[PDB]
């Protein structure tokens, strides 16, 4: 329950998940599978 | 796709083959390695239930820290609202390029003598927020303290601390902790570089409602972000800060401690 | 009105508290959210990226030269290239890395590590090296026979420039401490083992070539990695 | 694969020792949406006249080479019809394709990091000059590569989009960047969104008597561009 | 018809015609121009979600401001209830001809020495509301302070501030911030002009319940309107106020700053 | 009665606050609203002249 | 929920809309369309 | 199987037989006797409703007890978090080998003169929690007191006592009240024996926010376990404690009082 | 009803039962009935 | 807000009390419970030896 009018009044968020990091770790145009060699 | 725990481990047997080579990699491509544990050694089953919540943005950012600390001179002082004077919260916010958040501010105040020794004495204080283009008060008894349009909080040194929330107030779609540009057209002066006027939202001004005899207020402000959103992680800061409004630094030849030789752990 | 009773802890300001509060501007409507690339939700996404290790941290070595491991053509067999302790929150080569700085914001850690190495000689240069992880129980291994009894890889320099060793989570408890500081809390209890590198054959070159070459060393967290109890970064 | 061909407008580039292509933050360049737009006048989209490869003057990998950088869109602000459209308009938005080239024999060893950084400030000195902050199409030298010109460790630059050129493996690096800012559009003459940095981390060495003079060359295309607020032409 | 956001923008193409002429206007008719943006230039589509809530009457008027500030003399003082002494809230209410609203009043009080230096001393105070035709107390100990019919509030300088609501109390169907007329029949005297006796609702009287030694109360009052309704917007005030009960002013030859020439911005 | 805990910001007077309060005259009935020309609800209506 | 007896006790209104301004901007007896000339 | 009351009693008659012998036992086997009351004498029916709740772990452990008591020196002091200084709660926790619990901490503080005589004077205090590897403050005004990452509580000697909960924070799956081993590899020194570094979770540091004149803070801490779980009951302690961090003791020839002879009660 | 986010915030447990003590009192491999002799 | 009245015993610290309280670390997740021999729930089990 929220007691005040504006959302800046509300308490902290409780949606504390993580997600797949590939946008930072593997941002490459063509896929390179684990079992293969990278450059061919 | 979203996850509430870290990854499990499966059983793995020996491999003798030409067909599958997970240990070979090419760092040149700009990608981080994809070798899993199970590919590199024989593993057992482990059901792993460790959670990920203490490293969320709400987790890391959601707690109060010091932003200002000052005393009154002739029954007044003012503060430009900016998180640069105290380095601990400054060094955390510069881990992101752009962020949106609300802020919860907490104010703690007390009376001191001229020798900076604390005094058991309860007094009324007022804090006023003055946005840019508004006139600030000149002294303890100026008529801008009527506060009919500007917001105020009024309180006493013998109640518990004052506290208010504030929403996301920028003209932009996010605040900016790095800005590679100049303040205005036709002014490439070196003091006009790397400031965004859009983060500047004004002053706080403080007074005692009545004149203290010999004593002064001392005041501290704590800030806590809420509902964080963040884009484009940056490299962390690795040299001392020098100035409140700029990133200026001095160079040095190492970051970690030295040792006798590369072959001795 | 309603009878009430007020409990201890009334009027206290706890910095990690979480309550609703009145807003200074009740009718303010903020700007829209726009589409921006590179949104982050958890710092575990960031710690999973590779960064360079400051491995050559000795007195006469300064600036970018501190990131390179030396190799050279040998005239005897089975020699040692480098050693380091694997502990990610410890003072030393790891402390300036991405994985090192975030680990210094927290008191406890768990999970596997990824170490990755890249060769930077000429196309004509050849050799093989052996890289080993030694679990805890004594000092770093003193010879190549003593090292190859633990978890290891043999690396051959060819077309694919780079190799990964995975240091798997082998621990008594579910978590370890990030400091190893022995003067008060005896936390040297949590030391996690060593990684060492030896010649398997030799570095071999043609006539008039450069007889010295460099390796670069990268570290990152694996997907089972995590952190607990935030604290203030001592740097 | 190790072969590649890039074609934009009237221009084409080829390479035979590539190492894939990076697409920053997993996004390609794209148009401004009707929900996110604010300026009400009809935008200009020049097409193939602006969106094509330009080649900047070359840099020598000397014995003393510490590194070099470029600011976008500063570097292309006076070239072709990209330049003229940027001077005549108040606001600009767009992405980039970047290709760095450096070749040397099987008798040479060395390594370069090639990295694109959003919102990079120069700050080793109390007051950066206009020359150091906007060096044009010639670019400027790194004086402080270990602290990445900004007070961070060089070793942690790999959080930004990058590739390596390692002379035993490849001779070119390729990056594709979308538009990044806290606003939908901005002034092209007052704010630089990206910096391209090239830093040697293993120095250049070779078999005695091999060719000593080795250039590095940078080629850049604007991509998915639009402009608003037409007036007379204006420059810093 | 009612709206919760500002107007969107549609696409527009070129026009070459005799039949449609939106740029031509006639200011003589008393109407404001009706040329839209899309008629005057080629436009793009924009979905505009900006809200209109900070400029509502509740938005603009709904916050507290200072109306009175005084000290006791011989343990008593009184105040005629009227919003004219402090100009900031006065200048806002004179933007409407007629208004209806409820008011929330807040009272803040403290002890001072004879040198107007504040004192750490807690005392009981009383405020009494005395409507017209009721007898006001003469001094600190008069028998009108029994307060059996007149409302009172009693409180202490060491509790938080006193606060009460009040409803719309005029004999009219709205309050009036302009009145072009005289107070009564057969008195066209110049001091009887432009006052409405219908806004006058009486006094507040203040005392200390017991006699202070040497010290005095200092008192401040803040007022906040609630549930505003408003009719017939007026031109805003543009010269200083001179008197509490009248609109009197002095003339001057400009309103904005001068410049060197009309052709230089 | 009910156990409670009182938080910081207790007893503060914030001028832009919004709470219910006891009325000085609880039984007072005000005059009717009458028909008057030129009612305004938002100052955006005025700025457009 | 309201805790007190009289409506003067209640909190601030939350109906913060605007309306068509033609009673102040175009208060004329005969209509003058955008595309036409005003005086004819 | 689980029970909420103690066992009932049934009727029993006389027995003359070779076939059933409940009084004979063999203590050698390691089992406790199984002779019931009804087997040994003639009994009556009793419905027994006595409950078992005061001897549950929550029953026995769930109440607060003293863990620390100290004064500030030069406006600061610190405490290593460890339940060994005060023997009453120490002697209760060493009745189990392994336990998991949450803790509720309560802090009580007051001002004293240099003669350790109490003073009627209200002051602000701060408590900071500093985990291992974090830098502790050096004195009353060090910059580690910004507290932007480390948790703090701030309070006043004239409010009621401060109180916070804490969850189960060990790296192990339970705390340990006995540990037969050494701290680290290659250090069999006698001072390295019988300590588990895994129970050490850091310090608390205390200051006055401002400098007192001549006076000092005195501070007491109480701890209460909640949600107890427990494994492997131990023999109770029967000799005095000597040291805070070890089980060291001195021997003596008896445990109970003597008497004149074994045949005199 | 729980007012706070983490379970360490909650009040004391109310499940105050006991159980059969044979894991401590009779932990032997072969059963020895009350009416019988123990060693046979 | 709601009218209230505060009763005697307000602000007292009784060691055998039982109330909910704010936690110093709100997002902390503890280690799992593992299988250990010899769990005890009531000290009546021990006194019977
Ligand atoms: C009466 C209570 C006072 C509240 C005044 C609120 C003013 C709004 C403050 C919003 C916070 C702005 C934070 C934005 C950017 C940071 O300052 C950066 N360090 C700027 O470089
Ligand atoms: C014990 C609490 C005291 C409350 C006394 C309430 C008296 C009623 C006051 C209603 C407000 C009247 C406002 C009307 C008109 C303004 O004064 C104008 N400036 C008159 O020119
Ligand atoms: C700001 C409030 C301060 C709270 C600090 C909490 C730190 C965590 C304390 C957990 C309790 C640990 C108890 C464990 C073992 C005992 O100390 C044993 N006697 C060790 O031998
Ligand atoms: K899992
Ligand atoms: K709209
Ligand atoms: K029973």
Author numbering:
A (entry chain 4), G (entry chain 4), I (entry chain 4): 30 to 69
B (entry chain 1), E (entry chain 1), H (entry chain 1): 10 to 274
C (entry chain 3): 1 to 235
D (entry chain 2): 9 to 244
F (entry chain 3), J (entry chain 3): 1 to 49
What does the paper say about this structure?
Enteroviruses (EVs) form the largest genus within the Picornaviridae family and are one of the most widespread viruses infecting animals. During the viral lifecycle, the capsid precursor domain (P1) is cleaved into VP0, VP1 and VP3 which assemble into a protomer, the fundamental subunit capable of assembling into an icosahedral capsid. Following genome encapsidation, VP0 is further cleaved into VP2 and VP4 forming the mature capsid, with VP1–VP3 responsible for forming the outer surface, while VP4 lines the internal surface of the capsid. Here, we characterize the capsid structure from a possum enterovirus W6, classified as EV-F4, a recently isolated enterovirus from the Australian brushtail possum (Trichosurus vulpecula).
We used cryo-EM to reconstruct the map of the EV-F4 capsid at a resolution of 2.96 Å and build an atomic model. The quality of the cryo-EM map enabled us to build an atomic model for EV-F4 for residues 10 to 274 of VP1, 9 to 244 of VP2, 1 to 243 to VP3, and 30 to 68 of VP4. The structure has the usual picornavirus architecture, with the three major capsid proteins having a similar β-barrel fold with the following two β-sheets, each formed by four β-strands: BIDG and CHEF, while VP4 is located along the interior of the capsid. EV-F4 loops, as for EV-E1 and EV-F3, are shorter giving the capsid a much smoother appearance. Shortening of VP1 BC and DE loops in EV-F4 and EV-F3, but also in EV-A71 results in circular 5-fold mesas that remains open in the middle instead of the occluded star-shaped mesas found in poliovirus. In both EV-F4 and EV-F3 the VP3 GH loop insertion extends into the canyon between the tip of the 3-fold propellers and the 5-fold mesas. EV-F4 does not display any charged residues in the canyon region, while the corresponding region in EV-F3 is slightly negatively charged. Interestingly, in EV-F4, the north rim of the canyon has a prominent patch of positively charged residues, which is reduced in EV-F3 and further reduced in EV-E1. We modelled this fatty acid as a sphingosine, similar to the models of EV-F3 and EV71. In EV-F4, His208 replaces Asn208 in EV-F3 and -E1 as well as in the majority of EVs, introducing a charged residue in proximity to the head of the fatty acid pocket factor.
